[PDB]
From a paper:
We initially determined the crystal structure of P. aeruginosa Orn (OrnPa) with diribonucleotide substrate; however, crystal packing contacts prevented substrate binding (data not shown). Instead, we were able to crystallize two representative homologs, OrnVc and the human REXO2 (also known as small fragment nuclease or Sfn [Bruni et al., 2013]), bound to the diribonucleotide pGpG. Superimposing the two structures indicates their identical fold (rmsd of 0.75 Å for the protomer), which is preserved in the substrate-free Orn structure determined previously (rmsd of 0.54 Å for the protomer). The pGpG-bound structures reveal a narrow active site that is lined by the conserved acidic residues of the signature DEDD motif (D12, E14, and D112 of OrnVc; D15, E17, and D115 of REXO2) and the general base H158 or H162 in OrnVc or REXO2, respectively. In OrnVc, the bases of the diribonucleotide buttress against aromatic residues W61 and Y129, the latter being contributed from the second half-side of the dimeric enzyme. Residue L18 in OrnVc (L21 in REXO2) wedges in-between the two bases. Most notably, residues S108, R130, S135 and the hydroxyl group on Y129 (S111, R133, S138, and Y132 in REXO2) form hydrogen bonds with the 5' phosphate of pGpG, capping the substrate. This phosphate cap creates a major constriction of the active site, which is not observed in structurally related 3'−5' exoribonucleases such as RNase T or ExoI. By this assay, quantification of the diffusion zone reveals that OrnVc exhibits the highest affinity for diribonucleotide (Kd pGpG = 90 -/+9 nM), as compared to oligoribonucleotides of greater lengths. Mutations of the central phosphate cap residue R130 to alanine led to complete loss of catalytic activity, comparable to mutants in the DEDD active site motif. While expression of wild-type OrnVc complements the P. aeruginosa ∆orn resulting in a dispersed culture, complementation with variants that carry mutations in either the active site or phosphate cap residues results in cell aggregation indistinguishable from the ∆orn phenotype.
Numbering used by the authors: 1 to 181
The structure:
Amino acid sequence: MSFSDQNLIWIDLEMTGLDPEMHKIIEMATIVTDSELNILAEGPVIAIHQPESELAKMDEWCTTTHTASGLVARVRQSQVSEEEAIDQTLAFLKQWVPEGKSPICGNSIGQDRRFLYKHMPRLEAYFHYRYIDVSTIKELTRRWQPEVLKEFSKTGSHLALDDIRESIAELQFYRKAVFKI
Ligand code: NA
């Protein structure tokens, strides 16, 4: 439909921790916007099954965060592996954006990309090599005109789809508040 090589792929992952070599992906969500940030389509929101031995690597922050959000229960009940989650996500993305065209979009999205390289390289390969990191603009705004940041806030629930929606909202806010294009 609105298929375009200008569309942007937004992605957020939840993990059992901060180290791709030790930890695992437990949730993935994708959203496609057009080049003007209008949300065209939301992709699969997938809790990825992990065994207790992997959930047992979570520290207090991860355990409490992902238990309170309901994600841990969804992970335990999930019947979807990483490979199946890749398959579902690629089947969605192919309907909206051509392969290799969109940068990876989100907040501190380099961290998610590290997990993709390690655990989902077939999905990492779908992105252009560049990164659209909304937190780059956050950090520049904090230094150049920090009072701007008081006009926007986030809930930060660590539910992957809700967090990526907040990433898009943050960039929409910067478009009006700190850009002149
Ligand atoms: Na994130």
